[PDB]
């Protein structure tokens, strides 16, 4: 024997993208070449986000993609998103900003072309910026998923605020013992 330590062979990583999308594989090839040949950590992170799954790339929203450009210093920069930018029903005004994302929805593309912006894809973003200069890489609201609101140390023991599974949210379904002090214990 040599290694007195435990044997953890592979750390965590996903090397090749599990998706069989040919377009995603071509983008993986192109951004892998740029990541290993341009010394660009932007291309490193975008290549890792292309290795990243469908679920861990949450859909970006149009109001958030406006507000992350409304901050000072983001006038002429391009909002690069590895993921989808969708419509928002809340917004009223759209600026003249540039979009570089995968699979922008139809109403979002329509409102951006009415507002006067320019949407791109990753090959056009690579032709315009090999190292990724003038870009801001954005990500979406992961923790607001319905799946993540069931996740915690417990459903209710220091009251725990983590949403136990039930059919119908209301009366007669999980509201009696441990949910109030009058009927048994209370958390």
């Amino acid at each position: 024997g040599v290694d007195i330590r435990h044997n953890k062979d592979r750390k965590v990583r996903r090397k090749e993208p599990k998706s069989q999308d040919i377009y995603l594989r071509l983008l993986v090839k192109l951004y892998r070449f740029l990541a290993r040949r341009t010394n660009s950590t932007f291309n490193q992170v975008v290549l890792k986000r292309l290795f990243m799954s469908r679920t861990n790339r949450p859909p970006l929203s149009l109001s958030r993609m406006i507000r992350k450009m409304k901050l000072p210093g983001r006038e002429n920069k391009t909002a690069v998103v590895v993921g989808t930018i969708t419509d928002d029903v809340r917004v009223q005004e759209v600026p003249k900003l540039k979009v570089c994302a995968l699979r922008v929805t139809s109403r979002a593309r329509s409102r951006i072309l009415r507002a006067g912006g320019k949407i791109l894809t990753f090959d056009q973003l690579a032709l315009d910026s090999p190292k990724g200069c003038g870009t801001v890489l954005l990500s979406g609201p992961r923790k607001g998923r319905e799946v993540y609101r069931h996740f915690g140390k417990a459903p209710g023991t220091p009251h725990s605020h983590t949403k136990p599974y039930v059919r119908s949210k209301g009366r007669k379904f999980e509201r009696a013992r441990g949910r109030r002090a009058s009927r048994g214990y209370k958390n």
């Binding site: 069989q20 999308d21 040919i22 377009y23």
Partner: protein, 52 residues
């Protein structure tokens, strides 16, 4: 993504002067794995069950 012109052929094989612009269905993207998925599910739709 440009739309070229394809000639219309007669019953003898000679190219006629009638030229129709290529529609965008032939410029649409190609996803053979999605074709394989939908083809598999329609083949599952396309069968009598079997003996019980």
């Amino acid at each position: 993504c440009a739309r070229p012109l394809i000639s219309v052929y007669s019953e003898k094989g000679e190219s006629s002067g009638k030229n129709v612009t290529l529609p965008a269905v032939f410029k649409a993207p190609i996803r053979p794995d999605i074709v394989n998925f939908v083809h598999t599910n329609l083949r599952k739709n396309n069968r009598q069950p079997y003996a019980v």
